Structures are given as structure tokens and as C-alpha cells.
């Protein structure tokens, strides 16, 4: 396991996933939040200079909401019409006035069903 963590900041983490194309997928994204005159801010990217950040217009949106409650913001990322240029490698950039962090996941994209299916091959059930 090469997995090394240490009181992190960035609470929760937007856990990658596979969106069918044409689909819809969100993510999530939490940070520990001390202040509240202050907010920090998130930046979503892709690829390699494709910055999702100018992409959210249209066929992608983001969304951001803050929780007095706990302190605790919650960022996340909703892609419409996630088309097969959405896969690949995303990346997230949060510079806090406490402490900056970032994270990157990654994200699949499947060939929405069109025209009825083709010979298959494995077992069923139902």
C-alpha cells in the first residue's frame, strides 16, 4: 500500500468515477474551514492545460456551497453531456488562507447504448 496520508486538510475528496456518454456525473469535495470572513476557493482542471474551470459554461457547471454549521465548505462538479473528451485525468487546486491542498482523481467515459446490442458472451441472471 502506497497510500500516505497525515491530517489532511482537504476533508473529503472527489473519488473519480465512469460517466456513460451523454450522462450526467457530480463529484464531491469538502475542506476544514476556520474562518468565516475568508473562503477559499477551488479550481477544477483536466488533462494537461484544459482548465475545466473556463470549460464550465454549458455541457459542464460547477457548484459551490458553504456550512456555518461545521465551518466546512462543499465544492463539487457537474458534468452534462460528459462526452468521450471528458476522460482522463482531472486535477483539483484549493488555496486556503490556513493552508492549501490538492488532490486529483481520475475519470472514465462509456459509449452510451445506441442501436440494439450485438451477439454477447456470459452469464445472466433475471
Given at each position: 500500500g502506497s497510500s500516505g496520508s497525515s491530517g489532511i486538510l482537504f476533508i473529503e475528496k472527489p473519488q473519480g468515477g465512469t460517466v456513460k456518454v451523454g450522462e450526467?456525473?457530480?463529484?464531491?469535495?469538502?475542506?476544514?474551514?476556520?474562518?468565516?470572513?475568508?473562503?477559499?476557493?477551488?479550481?477544477?482542471?483536466?488533462?494537461?492545460?484544459?482548465?475545466?474551470?473556463?470549460?464550465?459554461?454549458?455541457?459542464?457547471?460547477?457548484?459551490?456551497?458553504?456550512?456555518?454549521?461545521?465551518?466546512?465548505?462543499?465544492?463539487?462538479?457537474?458534468?452534462?453531456?460528459?462526452?468521450d473528451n471528458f476522460a482522463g485525468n482531472y486535477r483539483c487546486e484549493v488555496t486556503y488562507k490556513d493552508k492549501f491542498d490538492s488532490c486529483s482523481f481520475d475519470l472514465e467515459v462509456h459509449e452510451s447504448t445506441g442501436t440494439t446490442p450485438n451477439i454477447d458472451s456470459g452469464p445472466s441472471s433475471g
Open positions: 450526467d456525473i457530480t463529484f464531491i469535495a469538502k475542506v476544514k474551514a476556520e474562518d468565516l470572513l475568508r473562503k477559499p476557493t477551488i479550481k477544477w482542471f483536466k488533462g494537461k492545460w484544459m482548465d475545466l474551470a473556463s470549460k464550465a459554461g454549458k455541457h459542464l457547471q460547477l457548484k459551490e456551497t458553504f456550512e456555518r454549521h461545521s465551518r466546512v465548505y462543499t465544492f463539487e462538479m457537474q458534468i452534462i453531456k460528459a462526452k
